[PDB]
């Protein structure tokens, strides 16, 4: 039994979001939330909102108890990048990269 | 530093612009070329 | 070539063999609409002069070539022609004589 959520086109570059995504992988949902609360990184609040969305999915739509759930998968894919011309330097380009954050949570049973 | 192109409205209407181009024959040829190309602004 | 008050049989589509009355015509894209035929289920939002909204089971338009007039004499689908009676043009039924419609 697995619930998931994705957040699409989040405006943080994927290298910066995979760093904190490596912390919560394979842990329990409660201690995952605690790890996300005690890291000062720009993407801990985004990821925490996706994780709370997936736990809400599991409780509401599949009637899983939210105290047994572990974070089964957590990953970040590249979304579409936006190209900006930096005027501040000399006419060289800057891409705003964006990402897709997927979290899936489960009770380990079948 | 001071640049090329220091704008001026009267000068711009006086060296280019419709009545100056219609006043010579080569100027009328630029307006005929620009019509024939279908330009939105002739001058 | 059919009109607003007619009684038709549908000859192609999910409703097939069904009959009905045409109720609007939309001729510039050739789509009549027949009652009881090709029912959609529209997801209609809450409007300013409405409740929250229904599944709105109404008829959708059908292409005009999937529909054939019923011969008034034999109730078979038939094509139509035009007879010229006294400067007026009437539809005839191509297996019999006239078919009369005003509604």
């Amino acid at each position: 039994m697995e619930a998931k959520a994705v957040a699409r086109t989040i405006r943080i570059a994927p290298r910066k979001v995979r760093l904190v995504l490596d912390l919560i992988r394979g842990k329990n949902a409660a201690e995952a939330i605690a790890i996300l609360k005690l890291t000062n990184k720009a993407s801990s609040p985004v990821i925490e909102k996706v994780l709370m969305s997936a736990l809400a999915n599991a409780e509401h739509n599949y009637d899983m108890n939210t105290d047994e759930l572990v974070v089964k998968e957590a990953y970040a894919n590249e979304g579409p990048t936006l190209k900006r011309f930096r005027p501040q330097g000399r006419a060289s380009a800057i891409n705003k990269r964006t990402s897709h954050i997927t979290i899936v949570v489960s009770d380990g049973k079948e | 530093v001071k640049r090329t192109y220091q704008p001026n409205k009267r000068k711009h209407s006086k060296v280019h612009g419709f009545r100056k181009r219609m006043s010579t024959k080569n100027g009328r040829k630029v307006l005929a070329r620009r019509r024939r190309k279908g330009r939105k602004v002739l001058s | 070539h059919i009109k607003k008050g007619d009684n038709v049989k549908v000859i192609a589509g999910k409703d097939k063999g069904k009959e009905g009355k045409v109720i609007a015509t939309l001729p510039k894209k050739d789509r009549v609409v027949v009652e009881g035929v090709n029912i959609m289920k529209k997801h209609q939002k809450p409007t300013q002069l409405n409740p929250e909204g229904g599944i709105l089971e109404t008829e959708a338009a059908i292409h005009v070539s999937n529909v054939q007039l019923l011969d008034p004499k034999t109730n078979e689908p038939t094509r139509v022609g035009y007879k010229f009676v006294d400067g007026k043009k009437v539809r005839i039924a191509k297996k019999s004589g006239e078919e009369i419609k005003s509604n």
Binding site: L19, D22, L23, A34, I35, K37, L38, T39 | - | -
Partner: protein, 48 residues
Amino acid sequence: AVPKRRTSKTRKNKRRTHFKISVPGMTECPNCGEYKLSHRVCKNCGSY
């Protein structure tokens, strides 16, 4: 300033093995609230 050869995938990822985040502290909230930073009355639910 320039690289002569492009670096491969394997050399890039061998360089990134120390480039990661350490796990935080977590002295737990015994009175009330969420788990707070170690030796903190942290600003979100601190009951140290």
